[PDB]
Amino acid sequence: DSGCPQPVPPENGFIRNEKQLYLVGEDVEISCLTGFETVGYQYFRCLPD
Amino acid sequence: QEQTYVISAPKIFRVGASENIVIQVYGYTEAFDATISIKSYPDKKFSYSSGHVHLSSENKFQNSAILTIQPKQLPGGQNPVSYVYLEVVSKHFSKSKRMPITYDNGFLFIHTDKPVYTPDQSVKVRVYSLNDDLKPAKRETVLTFIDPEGSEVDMVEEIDHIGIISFPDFKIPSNPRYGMWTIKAKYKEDFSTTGTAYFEVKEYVLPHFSVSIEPEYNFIGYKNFKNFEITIKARYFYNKVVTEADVYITFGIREDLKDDQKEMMQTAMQNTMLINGIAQVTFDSETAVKELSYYSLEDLNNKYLYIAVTVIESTGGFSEEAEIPGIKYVLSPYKLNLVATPLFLKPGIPYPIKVQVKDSLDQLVGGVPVTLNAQTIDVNQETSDLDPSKSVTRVDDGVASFVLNLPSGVTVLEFNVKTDAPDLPEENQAREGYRAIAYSSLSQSYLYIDWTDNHKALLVGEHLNIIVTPKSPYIDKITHYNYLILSKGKIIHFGTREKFSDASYQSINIPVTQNMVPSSRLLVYYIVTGEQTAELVSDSVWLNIEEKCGNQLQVHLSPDADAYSPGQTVSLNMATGMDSWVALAAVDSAVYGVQRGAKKPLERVFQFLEKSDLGCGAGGGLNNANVFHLAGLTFLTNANADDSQENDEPCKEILYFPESWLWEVHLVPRRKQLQFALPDSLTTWEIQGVGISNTGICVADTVKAKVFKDVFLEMNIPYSVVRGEQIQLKGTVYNYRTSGMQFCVKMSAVEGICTSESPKCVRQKVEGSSSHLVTFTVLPLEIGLHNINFSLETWFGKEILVKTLRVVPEGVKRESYSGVTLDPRGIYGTISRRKEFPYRIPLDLVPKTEIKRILSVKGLLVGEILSAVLSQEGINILTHLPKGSAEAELMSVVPVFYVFHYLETGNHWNIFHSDPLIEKQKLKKKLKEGMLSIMSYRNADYSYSVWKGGSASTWLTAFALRVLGQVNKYVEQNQNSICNSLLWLVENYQLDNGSFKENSQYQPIKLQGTLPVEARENSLYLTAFTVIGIRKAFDICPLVKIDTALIKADNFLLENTLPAQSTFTLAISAYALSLGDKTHPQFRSIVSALKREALVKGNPPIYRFWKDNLQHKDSSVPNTGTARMVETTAYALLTSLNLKDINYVNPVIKWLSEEQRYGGGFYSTQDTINAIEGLTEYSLLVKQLRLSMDIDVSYKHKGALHNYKMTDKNFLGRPVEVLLNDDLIVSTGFGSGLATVHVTTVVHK
């Protein structure tokens, strides 16, 4: 289906909804480990490529 | 085997279609009746339709039943019905066959008014809406708009009254993503039909003239690799040659028709003159490649040529460019394939063959020689080779034709067709080998038709006449043959054809009725009873029916003119043979010129309508069954044949200045004449309309109308101008007078623009038939849209033209993004039903610019839901195994409590009517009794023991604390006693490295407790269980020191779970931490280990679970190994539910619902309680994620903005531009589920 595979989250971040595959146009909200806060736009979004 | 039947039906039943099903019986004499019926599958309980059909000699024992699967009578729901039973019943037979059904009923032709749009435009769009019958569908329909990133942007839905669905004009969002947008159209509710259309969003400007680049070939071969030749021409959009342009040629290498940017050339970079509309160019590809590149030979050049061309009009300000994105260098220039060729032999009858020679760019080569080698076998491998025939292709179609008068004994033909252009070697002459096979009758019994493979299509309403010849050992039995005529998937005609006394059979003398006008198909058959064995014999053929509409709506400009003046009052007469609706549109031909590589909106409409043909190829087949399958039919017969062997494979054989206006819908009561004034745009307008009637759709002939004037001005204002910059603006005046004369244009502009000209002029004379360049140098002070007229005051008077300048801010356009997930239940924890976004202002705003802002809410769907539930055994778990010693009372009641809470999830009182409702009061009573019992076992010191005089058990006390944590959901236990029990348990047994080591209780009651891996550090188990019990108690007895002991125990449990030990320990520890810090890094690392230990079935996991200790051994009954298995899996389930990882949990729930190891666990209390806890928590989290949220977004100081009714249906409100300069507060009602919303802020620096 050539969607998006799971991205590696940034340091001290994690995926709210870890999956094998994310749909085109689907956005994944990262979140920060117990000691950390998110700064910036915490969503990656699956592009058609 | 004399008494036989055929019922023949479409290969697939379309939902709601009227399907015509036809029955023939053979060798009966007494007039008898049958019923044909459609019934639910597999149960045959529900008749979707039935038809009584009388069969008699009077009918030649033939009839059809018309049967329809009404869409509402299907059960629908989560699972579409895939299959259905067709049934026949008579005095003499009954049989039923499983038909597939499909919901793909009808067509959704999306028409947008234009192929491309700029930002700050709106796309007027409408859909034509038809059944599988060509009647107007009258079905309510939803458009789904999709951006170039694939995000859904809007759903808009309309009720069809007409077959024309005029949707609301979709304003392009206040910041579009560029590129190809998509629209998908679906009927609501009950059909799968999906229309699709596209449009590109770009900052385009209307081209002033077309540039056409015209290579002689889309390939270069041996002949042209030395040198290639390529014409260029250009015309103004009023269809007159561009008199003079400077042409600059920019060749490049290419490798891929799809996309590449291979090295652009820097040699033979020809600059040349276009004259009288044409430039002729040539390219010595050999010289250019050898000079520029390290490539030097066509052998190195299985590749492509790029060319771009740009042309500058030699006396004016309009300049235009175009490209050919690849001319294929290849030693084999052509490719070859068969067309309309059966690959099935009619022996003795002439076998025609047609073969098409095609470009490497998928285009017809035209005239080429071809030779066809042929080899035949008749019988017993008796092999003979035929003389190789030779032919040449048709100069337009590229189709060569052949025919072989094969032997009457021929059984197979294998034949090799090779291109015979002598200038190509055989390795480059496109050549192919093919095999064609006889009908392979069992009883040497065949059916052939005289159809002369007519290359011309049949003409509507003519009497077609096809002669048909059965041949068989038993011809004197056959007496007649049947025929079926197929249009789309549907049997539109049927009949029978008697043997004359001549032993000659009636031909198919039939009118090609108007329902056949899409290319149609014919199948003929008979059953012959043989000596005693019946055989079904059949054949089929393809019939092209020349595409004549039913309406044939003819529409013409009654004041016929070569060209109209701008603003000319015109009378457009539409005439139709009958009352018809019509849709009308006008679009500037220059807009089709805007798209580099244009296409029309309704090209190929008829071949799209023909997609409903279920058959393929020219006809014939390997067998009667294969003939029926390839015709797109299926059949029920006792005559020793069946379709079922053949797969449903996807057979693929080949057989004022507006940009648009007049966008209107009208009734034409057979005729209506509509008069209107054309726009002021001096261009050819492409006028198109579509008639819609009960007869079907008909796209009218496209009307091209030229708007022309002897003199005019046009100005090359770009799509937008940078604010605060002096610009050079270029135009040219065009003279089509016979003679030159003095012209001036006085420009006049709003004070928002200044120019050095400061307009009366020299009033230059343009010479006749010529254009003169005009240029102004202007600076726009102000953003947005600004008016500027031009008056071409020339001969004895004024002239008027008007334009709007578009002004864009300097520097960079910049943007930011921010957003949140709204969470009114705290599914992720922090309840987040409100947020605010300030009116943030960047550090370097371009001082006069304003920040554009666009909000974008997005729904989050539940996904898959699993109906994991308890059986009516919940009633046994209420009445459960006798209360008494061994605390069989505790074993009975604690399940009563957990069942209580499961039922308390609510479904099992509203819906449980399938089973006996658990009486609320009875459940309450039993609950109360268990509460009293559990109290009775409490130790005086608020410890617990099973034996009255037994030791305190920290384990069993934690189990009590868990259960009494559940009970409060309906009947609180007196919290004082709970608090005292907690204080006892922690104060007595909180060790400082591990905790709550168990006291000297005589034994765990093995069915009440469980066996942990006591061989190593059972303190891990005890700590986990005590933690879990404390967790379930704390909310009813929050205590700071209990919190501290929790922290300690969690820390020890983490640090001592870093070695994996045994996976039961890992799962129960992970669950304990899931109750604690859901998000600690090492917690997650433990989770990532557990998820590694999970076994799965299927590559996408259908089931997921964990095993240890060789539990892979079979066990017919629950046991301690299955107890450990179920426990560790249930703890992993509970952990994953704490993670809310439904996509991970679902296959675990499905596994657990199997009850593999039937009865489960040891059937211990522990496994059962953890399993039910997991099932309840799953059904809870499922109903939590159910999305319902009325998210109301508003400004802080200013009013409300929008109120998205976010629902499983309306799950995605459109993006809203945040106009007003204020802080934004987004809010929701308590609602349900999760959603996320984003604002983007767009600004200049």
Ligand SMILES: *[C@@H]1O[C@H](CO)[C@@H](O[C@@H]2O[C@H](CO)[C@@H](O)[C@H](O)[C@H]2NC(C)=O)[C@H](O)[C@H]1NC(C)=O
């Ligand atoms: C461009 O031409 C139009 C058409 O004449 C001008 O608009 C007219 O302005 C006068 C007043 O100056 C009104 O009385 C007319 O009714 C307007 N015509 C309309 C509304 O169609 C416009 O002002 C001109 N702009 C210039 C010269 O910059």
